[PDB]
DNA sequence: AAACGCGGGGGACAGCGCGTACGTGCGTTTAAGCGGTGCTAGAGCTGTCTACGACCAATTGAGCGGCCTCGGCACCGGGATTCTCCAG
DNA sequence: CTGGAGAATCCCGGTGCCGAGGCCGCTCAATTGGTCGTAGACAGCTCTAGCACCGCTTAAACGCACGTACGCGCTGTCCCCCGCGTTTT
C-alpha cells in the first residue's frame, strides 16, 4: 500500500541545521507524529475563527492570528516573521 | 496604577470564605494579587487577539467566551 | 464577645448560599482596563465582556483556595500559607 | 512555461501542494486561500528546525551522531517554550529529565 | 499427588510487582515508600486503564473490526487530552 | 563486619540510574494479560496488536510517573520523605480525578 | 434582525416535566448556551469519526457511537435507546 | 529477577512549650456606585461588484516503495578512578 | 583532614552488526492554462453604546486594640521499611 509522510522534508531541514547529524527512524516517526498534530491544531482553530466571523475562506490573516493564538511568545513572534517573509516572497514570486 | 490593590482584603477574605477558608495568613493577600494578574493577563492578551482580528475596537464578551473556552474554562450565560 | 473562629464559620456558612460577586466592580473594572492596556492601546469594553471576565476571575480564585486549603490541611494546619498555593499551583501544572 | 514548485517559489522546503490538497480534503473550509497553505508551511519548517537544532545540540552533549527521542525528550522539556507548547504531549521512550529533590539530598 | 491444582492464584493485578513499583518510583524520584502504596497504585493504574480501554475499544466496533489497533488507541489517548507521539 | 551501605544511599544511586535510563519497567507478559483481562467487561474476545499492546505501557507508565513526582512533592510540603497514599489520593483530587 | 435560539423548545419540555415551573432569563440564556455546546461537542467527533474510517457521510450510528464517547455509562444507555426509539418512530412513519 | 526472610536503624509520630500573629470588634473614614445628563465613536447595516478560487483538462516528475552496504553503536574486559562507609 | 577497605563508575580499545542512508525504477499528484460565480471587503448611512463626569450618601473600607489560639521548634521513642544474600519463580 502507498503511505505518504513527511520524512524526506524533515531530513532536508536537518541537513540544513546539522548537515552531518544522523537520525533514527522512530524519532523521525515522532517528527511525523508531531507535525501532523500542530498541522491539525492550527487548521481547526483556523477554521473556527472563520466561523466566528462567519467567513467561508481561510487565508493567512486567519492563519497568522491563530499562530499568534497557538504559538506562545517568542515562537509566535518569530514564526509570524517566518510566515510573513515567505508570503511576500511568494506573492512577489 | 495599583488597581490590583483595589481588590481589598475583605474582597480577598470574602472569596476565601466562599472558598471555605477558616484562618488566613497575612502574606496570602499579595500572593493572590500577583497570581490573579497572571489569570487576567493571559486571557486579555488572547481575548483582544480576537477583537483585533475581527477588526473591531470594542471588546465583546463573545470574544471573551471564545478565549476562556480556548483556555479550557467553558462558560455559560453571556450570549452563546 | 464571640470567641475567634465562630464568625468565620458563620461567614463561611453565609457566603456559600450567597451567589453574587464578592469583588467591587469599579476596582474590578479599572484593573481590567489597566491590564488590557499592556497588549494593545485604546480598547473599548462591553460591560458583558468585563462582567464575563469578572465571573471567570472569582470562579477562578475560589477553587484555588479550596485546593490551597486542602494543601494546608494536609500539612496538619488550619492556617493557609502561600507555599500551599505554590504547591497547589505546581501540581495543576500551570506553575 | 516551465514547472516551478510553489515551495521553490517561496524558497521553502515543505510541500505546499500536498497541504493545499490536504487543506482541500481537510474540510476546514469550503474555500481556502492560496497563501495560507504557503503561510503555514514555512512556519512548519521553522519549528522543526527549531526543535531539530535543539535535537542536534543535545545529541552532541552525549557525543552521539544520530538523534533519538531521549534527545528529543530532553530538548523540548529543557526548552521552557517548547515544554509549555507541548505540555499535553508525552514522548515515547523519551524518559525523564534527571532531577532529584533538594530535600532528598543527604545531609 | 493432588498437585495439578496447587497453583491457581494468579489474579493478574499483582502482576505489577513491588520491585517494579519501586523501580517505577525510583525513576520518578521517590526515596522511600510506604508498603500500602503498592496496592493503592494497583487501583490507580487500573482505573486509569479501562477508561481509555473502554474508549479505545469504543472505536473498534464502529469500524466493524475485531482486532485493536495502535492507531485506534492512539485516538483513545487524545480524547482525554494526553497525546502521544511515535506510533503514527 | 559486613559492608552495608547507609540506608538511602543505595536509593539515591537507584534514583540516578533510572533517570538516565529510558526503558520500560513493567514486564510485558504480566502487562498484556492485564489488558486482555480488562477487555472482557466491554466486549468479549478481541485480538490485540503488540504495537497497541506496547503503546499501552507508555501511557500506563507516563501517567503513573507524573503521578509519582507530584506525590513526591506532597510529603516534602507535608515535611516528610516517605510517601503516604494520602499524598497520592491528594494529588489526584488536586488533579481532580476522583 | 431575526436571531434564533432554543428557549421555546426548552419551554415545552419544561412544561413536560414541570408544567407549572417558571425559569429566569439568566437561566434561559444558560440553557441556550448549554445546549449549543452539547451539540458542538458530539458534532465534531462524529465529523472526526467519519474521517477516521475514511467514510464520507455522517449517520446516526456515528452520533450513536459519538454519544457513547461522551455521556457516562448509565445515562448513555438511556439516550441511545431514546435515540434508537425516535429514528425507529421516525423511520416507521 | 522476584520472593522472602531478617535484622536494624532511622524517621514518623506523639507530646510539649510558647510566642505572636491573627481574629474579634469598631469608630472613623471612605470610597463605591447610581441615575442623570452629554457626547460620539464605531459598529452594524445595505449595496455592490469584482477578482480570484473553484472548476476542468492536460501533463510530468517528484516522491515513495524497493533495494543494497557498511558505520554508528552497543557491548566486554580490564583497568583506572572515585566514593562511600568506617578508621582514625 | 583522611579511608584502612571494599565497592562502585567511568573510560579506554576491540567486536560485531544492521539500520541509516544513497541508489533505482514508476505512477499519479502537483503544476499549468484555461472559465465563471460568488464572497466579502469597502463606501455610505445609521445610531447604539461607549465614555465623561457630577454629586451625594452610605455601606464598606480602613486603620487600629487585644487577646489567644495555633504555628513551630524540639526530643525521645518505636517500629516499619531499607540493604542483602540466597532460594525460588
TrEMBL record, chain C:
Full-protein residues shown: 41 to 135 of 136
One annotated Gene Ontology cellular component of this protein: nucleus
Major site of localization recorded for this protein: nucleus
UniProt name for this protein: Histone H3
Compartment list: Chromosome; Nucleus
Similarity-based family: Belongs to the histone H3 family.
Subunit composition and interactions: The nucleosome is a histone octamer containing two molecules each of H2A, H2B, H3 and H4 assembled in one H3-H4 heterotetramer and two H2A-H2B heterodimers. The octamer wraps approximately 147 bp of DNA.
Any one GO molecular-function label of the UniProt entry: DNA binding
Keywords: Acetylation, ADP-ribosylation, Chromosome, DNA-binding, Hydroxylation, Methylation, Nucleosome core, Nucleus, Ubl conjugation
Encoding gene (name): LOC121398065
From TrEMBL, chain D:
Protein name (record): Histone H2A
Keywords assigned by UniProt, alphabetized: Acetylation, Chromosome, DNA-binding, Isopeptide bond, Nucleosome core, Nucleus, Phosphoprotein, Ubl conjugation
Family: Belongs to the histone H2A family.
Domain Histone H2A C-terminal: 80-107
Keyword Ubl conjugation: yes
Top-level taxonomy: Eukaryota, Metazoa, Chordata, Craniata, Vertebrata
Molecular functions per Gene Ontology: DNA binding; protein heterodimerization activity; structural constituent of chromatin
Gene Ontology CC: nucleosome; nucleus
Function: Core component of nucleosome. Nucleosomes wrap and compact DNA into chromatin, limiting DNA accessibility to the cellular machineries which require DNA as a template. Histones thereby play a central role in transcription regulation, DNA repair, DNA replication and chromosomal stability. DNA accessibility is regulated via a complex set of post-translational modifications of histones, also called histone code, and nucleosome remodeling.
Residues of the Core Histone H2A/H2B/H3 domain: 1-77
The keyword Phosphoprotein belongs to this UniProt entry's keyword annotation: yes
Subcellular location, record wording: Chromosome; Nucleus
GO process terms (BP): heterochromatin formation
TrEMBL record, chain F:
Organism from which the protein derives: Xenopus laevis (African clawed frog)
Keyword Ribonucleoprotein found: no
Main location, first listed in the record: nucleus
Protein name: Histone H3
Protein localization: Chromosome; Nucleus
Similarity comment: Belongs to the histone H3 family.
Domain of life according to the entry: Eukaryota
GO cellular component: nucleosome; nucleus
Keywords, sorted A to Z: Acetylation, ADP-ribosylation, Chromosome, DNA-binding, Hydroxylation, Methylation, Nucleosome core, Nucleus, Ubl conjugation
GO molecular function, one term: DNA binding
Keyword DNA-binding among record annotations: yes
Domain Core Histone H2A/H2B/H3: 7-94
Subunit structure of this chain's protein: The nucleosome is a histone octamer containing two molecules each of H2A, H2B, H3 and H4 assembled in one H3-H4 heterotetramer and two H2A-H2B heterodimers. The octamer wraps approximately 147 bp of DNA.
Amino acid at each position: 500500500s502507498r503511505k505518504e509522510s513527511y520524512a524526506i522534508y524533515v531530513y532536508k531541514v536537518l541537513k540544513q541545521v546539522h548537515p552531518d547529524t544522523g537520525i533514527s527512524s522512530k524519532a523521525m516517526s515522532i517528527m511525523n507524529s508531531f507535525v501532523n498534530d500542530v498541522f491539525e491544531r492550527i487548521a481547526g482553530e483556523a477554521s473556527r475563527l472563520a466561523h466566528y466571523n462567519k467567513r467561508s475562506t481561510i487565508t493567512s490573516r486567519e492563519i497568522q492570528t491563530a499562530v499568534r493564538l497557538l504559538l506562545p511568545g517568542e515562537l509566535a513572534k518569530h514564526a509570524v516573521s517566518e510566515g510573513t517573509k515567505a508570503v511576500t516572497k511568494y506573492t512577489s514570486a | 496604577r495599583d488597581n490590583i490593590q483595589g481588590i481589598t482584603k475583605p474582597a480577598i477574605r470574602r472569596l476565601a470564605r466562599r472558598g471555605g477558608v477558616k484562618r488566613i495568613s497575612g502574606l496570602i493577600y499579595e500572593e493572590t494579587r500577583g497570581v490573579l494578574k497572571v489569570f487576567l493577563e493571559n486571557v486579555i492578551r488572547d481575548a483582544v487577539t480576537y477583537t483585533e482580528h475581527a477588526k473591531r475596537k470594542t471588546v465583546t464578551a463573545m470574544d471573551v467566551v471564545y478565549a476562556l473556552k480556548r483556555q479550557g474554562r467553558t462558560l455559560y450565560g453571556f450570549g452563546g | 464577645r464571640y470567641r475567634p473562629g465562630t464568625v468565620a464559620l458563620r461567614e463561611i456558612r453565609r457566603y456559600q448560599k450567597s451567589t453574587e460577586l464578592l469583588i467591587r466592580k469599579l476596582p474590578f473594572q479599572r484593573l481590567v482596563r489597566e491590564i488590557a492596556q499592556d497588549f494593545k492601546t485604546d480598547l473599548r469594553f462591553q460591560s458583558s465582556a468585563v462582567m464575563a471576565l469578572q465571573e471567570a476571575s472569582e470562579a477562578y480564585l475560589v477553587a484555588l483556595f479550596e485546593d490551597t486549603n486542602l494543601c494546608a490541611i494536609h500539612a496538619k494546619r488550619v492556617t493557609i500559607m502561600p507555599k500551599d498555593i505554590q504547591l497547589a499551583r505546581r501540581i495543576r501544572g500551570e506553575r | 512555461a516551465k514547472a516551478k514548485t510553489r515551495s521553490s517559489r517561496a524558497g521553502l522546503q515543505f510541500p505546499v501542494g500536498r497541504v493545499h490538497r490536504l487543506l482541500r480534503k481537510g474540510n476546514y473550509a469550503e474555500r481556502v486561500g492560496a497563501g495560507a497553505p504557503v503561510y503555514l508551511a514555512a512556519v512548519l519548517e521553522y519549528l522543526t528546525a527549531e526543535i531539530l537544532e535543539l535535537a542536534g545540540n543535545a545529541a552532541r552533549d552525549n557525543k552521539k551522531t544520530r538523534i533519538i527521542p531521549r534527545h528529543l525528550q530532553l530538548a523540548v522539556r529543557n526548552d521552557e517554550e517548547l515544554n509549555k507548547l507541548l505540555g499535553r504531549v508525552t514522548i515515547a521512550q523519551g524518559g525523564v529529565l534527571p532531577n532529584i529533590q533538594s530535600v532528598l539530598l543527604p545531609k
